[PDB]
Amino acid sequence: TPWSKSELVRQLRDLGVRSGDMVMPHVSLRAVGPLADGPQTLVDALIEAVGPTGNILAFVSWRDSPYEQTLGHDAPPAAIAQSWPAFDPDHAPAYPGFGAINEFIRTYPGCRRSAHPDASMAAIGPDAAWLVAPHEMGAAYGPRSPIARFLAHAGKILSIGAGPDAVTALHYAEAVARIEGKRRVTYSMPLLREGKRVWVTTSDWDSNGILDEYAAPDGPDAVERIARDYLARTRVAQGPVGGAQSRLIDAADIVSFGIEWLEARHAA
Ligand SMILES: NC[C@H]1O[C@H](O[C@H]2[C@H](O)[C@@H](O[C@H]3O[C@H](CO)[C@@H](O)[C@H](N)[C@H]3O)[C@H](N)C[C@@H]2N)[C@H](N)[C@@H](O)[C@@H]1O
Numbered sequence: 001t002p003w004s005k006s007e008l009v010r011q012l013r014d015l016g017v018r019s020g021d022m023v024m025p026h027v028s029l030r031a032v033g034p035l036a037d038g039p040q041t042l043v044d045a046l047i048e049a050v051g052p053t054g055n056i057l058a059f060v061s062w063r064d065s066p067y068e069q070t071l072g073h074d075a076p077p078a079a080i081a082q083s084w085p086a087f088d089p090d091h092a093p094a095y096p097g098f099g100a101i102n103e104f105i106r107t108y109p110g111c112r113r114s115a116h117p118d119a120s121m122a123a124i125g126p127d128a129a130w131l132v133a134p135h136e137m138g139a140a141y142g143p144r145s146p147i148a149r150f151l152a153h154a155g156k157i158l159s160i161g162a163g164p165d166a167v168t169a170l171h172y173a174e175a176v177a178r179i180e181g182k183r184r185v186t187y188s189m190p191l192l193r194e195g196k197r198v199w200v201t202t203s204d205w206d207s208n209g210i211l212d213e214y215a216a217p218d219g220p221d222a223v224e225r226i227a228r229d230y231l232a233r234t235r236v237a238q239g240p241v242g243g244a245q246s247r248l249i250d251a252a253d254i255v256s257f258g259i260e261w262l263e264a265r266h267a268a
């Protein structure tokens with residue numbers, strides 16, 4: 001029988017979500033199983049669980065990010081440059097590959113959306129505007145990004161059937177780790193500025209693997225390795241949300257662990 005909003009809220013409370021919390025979810029809807037009203041049921045449950053003073057932050061990206069089409073070039077290729085849509089935060093759909101729940105989050109009334117087209121973050125709650133801006137090119141997951149502010153805001157990572165590789169906040173640890181050999185990428189995104197499309201080319205840390213040994217397309221990357229080690233070494237509330245094995249992780253603690261993990265393994 002499909003899970004109801006009330007059942008999910010009670011499960012979230014059992015896992016340790018409290019009114020007023022700042023939560024970043026990573027969801028496998030397949031693991032959760034059927035929901036009374038589809039994915040919206042779990043969105044509504046998350047909002048109820050954090051309450052009217054709580055906040056949700058999600059990494060939603062953009063269905064049409066021209067990442068692969070511009071990667072490695074000093075400017076967008078001519079055909080891309082002429083016809084790609086500018087990123088419009090009000091209308092651009094979320095990227096399906098990071099979870100189908102994210103499009104429901106981003107379209108929720110009052111949701112705010114960050115300006116970085118590839119790293120776009122959506123937030124719901126009283127602190128949403130403060131969470132989502134600034135989000136500049138060159139600051140995808142590191143200092144000055146919404147992730148940085150999430151980590152300063154008592155953030156909790158709510159993994160609902162998701163694997164250790166899903167922990168986006170660990171890209172902050174990669175950004176700040178004092179290690180040699182860090183990989184960077186160059187790409188271009190089409191922004192809206194005063195109603196006009198402006199292409200911006202930037203470099204940033206490689207979010208597909210901070211060192212060569214973490215950058216195999218299949219993984220495992222550093223996020224996955226760090227998170228697997230952390231979860232083997234730390235008390236973390238675990239329990240069901242819907243049909244999904246779930247965990248509620250202190251974000252600052254896992255990111256600090258990840259910085260240490262990288263710096264212990266890689267020369268400065
Ligand atoms: N590397 C191994 C990991 O790979 C993917 O996760 C990555 C994404 O690939 C990356 O995406 C970027 O590169 C994509 C491919 O070019 C673009 O499509 C996308 N627009 C662009 O933002 C995110 N920023 C960070 C995330 N950890 C898998 N989901 C994950 O399970 C696996 O562990």
Ligand SMILES: [Mg+2]
Pocket residue numbers: 053126127
């Ligand atoms: Mg508050």
Ligand SMILES: [Mg+2]
Pocket residue numbers: 090106107108109110111
């Ligand atoms: Mg809207």
